[PDB]
Amino acid sequence: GVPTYGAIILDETLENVLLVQGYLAKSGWGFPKGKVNKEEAPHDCAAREVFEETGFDIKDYICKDDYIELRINDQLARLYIIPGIPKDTKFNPKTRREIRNIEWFSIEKLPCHRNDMTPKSKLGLAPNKFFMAIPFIRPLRDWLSRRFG
Ligand SMILES: CC(C)n1ccc(C(=O)NCc2ccc(F)cc2)n1
């Protein structure tokens, strides 16, 4: 699969993260990210996808070594960590045909796993609108503890 790049943007307090909500298959909440183009450097793809989805340019803030990367079903997703962005920043996507809404979420309230259905003796996981963000939440909380305390 083609690698994806984007950002985990936090506010000044470090307790909120910015998620975006797409449509249809991308109908839940997730970190802003997208597929890398031919010859495009990972930091440039992250800034482009982030600016396409939020209107906010992270180029002057990206730190090369500060990211979380996960391999999910043989697709690599790397989100550069971008703290300290004021909560009153005006985010607007470029294409409202792709992004429904953009919101800050409390990190501590976000789930870091989906729930089973052991109540119902049924296998699998219950739907959760934060499905795409979930895999990054525990690695983020651990990264913030290490790098900030
Ligand atoms: C399996 C399905 C649920 N899926 C695939 C990708 C996403 C996702 O990333 N959702 C949030 C999102 C990010 C970028 C964007 F441009 C629009 C929406 N969700």
Curated annotation (Swiss-Prot):
Tissue specificity as recorded in UniProt:
Expressed in brain and testis. Not detected in heart (at protein level).
Q: Name one GO biological process term.
A: regulation of telomerase RNA localization to Cajal body
Q: Does the keyword ATP-binding apply?
A: no
User: Where's it found, cell-wise?
Assistant: Cytoplasm, P-body; Nucleus
Q: What is its main location?
A: cytoplasm
Q: Which GO terms describe its molecular function?
A: 5'-(N(7)-methylguanosine 5'-triphospho)-[mRNA] hydrolase activity; 5'-3' RNA exonuclease activity; manganese ion binding; RNA exonuclease activity, producing 5'-phosphomonoesters; telomerase RNA binding
Where does this chain carry the motif Nudix box? Answer: 34-55
Which keywords are on file for this protein? Cytoplasm, Hydrolase, Manganese, Metal-binding, Nonsense-mediated mRNA decay, Nucleus, Phosphoprotein, RNA-binding
On modification after translation, the UniProt record reads: Phosphorylated at ser-249 in a MTOR-dependent manner.
What domain of life? Answer: Eukaryota
Instruction: Indicate the segments forming the Nudix hydrolase domain, all copies.
Output: 1-131
One Gene Ontology cellular component annotation held by this UniProt entry: RISC complex
In this chain, Mn(2+) is annotated as bound at 49, 53
Asked if the keyword Hydrolase belongs to this entry, the reply reads yes
Name the job this protein performs. Answer: Decapping metalloenzyme that catalyzes the cleavage of the cap structure on mRNAs. Removes the 7-methyl guanine cap structure from mRNA molecules, yielding a 5'-phosphorylated mRNA fragment and 7m-GDP. Necessary for the degradation of mRNAs, both in normal mRNA turnover and in nonsense-mediated mRNA decay. Plays a role in replication-dependent histone mRNA degradation. Has higher activity towards mRNAs that lack a poly(A) tail. Has no activity towards a cap structure lacking an RNA moiety.
What is the protein's quaternary organization?
Found in a mRNA decay complex with LSM1, LSM3, LSM4, EXOSC2, EXOSC4, EXOSC10, PARN, XRN1, CNOT6, UPF1, UPF2 and UPF3B. Forms a complex with DCP1A, EDC3, DDX6 and EDC4/HEDLS, within this complex directly interacts with EDC4/HEDLS. Interacts with DPC1B. Interacts (via N-terminus and C-terminus) with TRIM21 (via N-terminus and C-terminus). Associates with polysomes. Interacts with LIMD1, WTIP and AJUBA. Interacts with DDX17 in an RNA-dependent manner. Interacts with ZC3HAV1. Interacts with APOBEC3G in an RNA-dependent manner. Interacts with ZFP36L1 (via N-terminus). Interacts with NBDY.
Q: Which family does it belong to?
A: Belongs to the Nudix hydrolase family. DCP2 subfamily.
Protein name according to UniProt: m7GpppN-mRNA hydrolase
Organism whose genome encodes this protein: Homo sapiens
**Covered range of the whole protein:** 96 to 244 of 420
